Amino acid sequence: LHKEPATLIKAIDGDTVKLMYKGQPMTFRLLLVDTPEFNEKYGPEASAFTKKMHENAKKIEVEFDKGQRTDKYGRGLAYDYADGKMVNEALVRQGLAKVAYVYKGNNTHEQLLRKAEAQAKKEKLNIWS
């Protein structure tokens, strides 16, 4: 896989963000994770986490996997990097997202995220408390 540029347009919630990609506004849905909705427990914390991570970044990148690049709602499906640090992974590592939505052919970073989730669970963080 490879990283490609994007710029933040606006925070949305824990696992979706509006980015400009190839010069077009898109909503991106983060691969292989599920954050709580804003109205749910740890939703506001997940939203804040993802907002901060994108807003503080000098450089945002997206990395598409080998399969589907947009979902049925027109959202881009990607791994999102803030100054080289994967947002998807960080969410999981902090207990603010579960590994989820693992479809065959877009699951390159599955095991990386599962390892993170295991560490979050061991530390009893957030969703795992």
Ligand SMILES: Cc1cn([C@H]2C[C@H](OP(=O)(O)O)[C@@H](COP(=O)(O)O)O2)c(=O)[nH]c1=O
């Ligand atoms: C993460 C992801 C979600 N989706 C779809 C499945 C779910 O369909 P349904 O809306 O029918 O439940 C939905 C979950 O996203 P959200 O967690 O953003 O709701 O997005 C994909 O198709 N591919 C993906 O990789």
Ligand SMILES: [Ca+2]
């Ligand atoms: Ca969600």
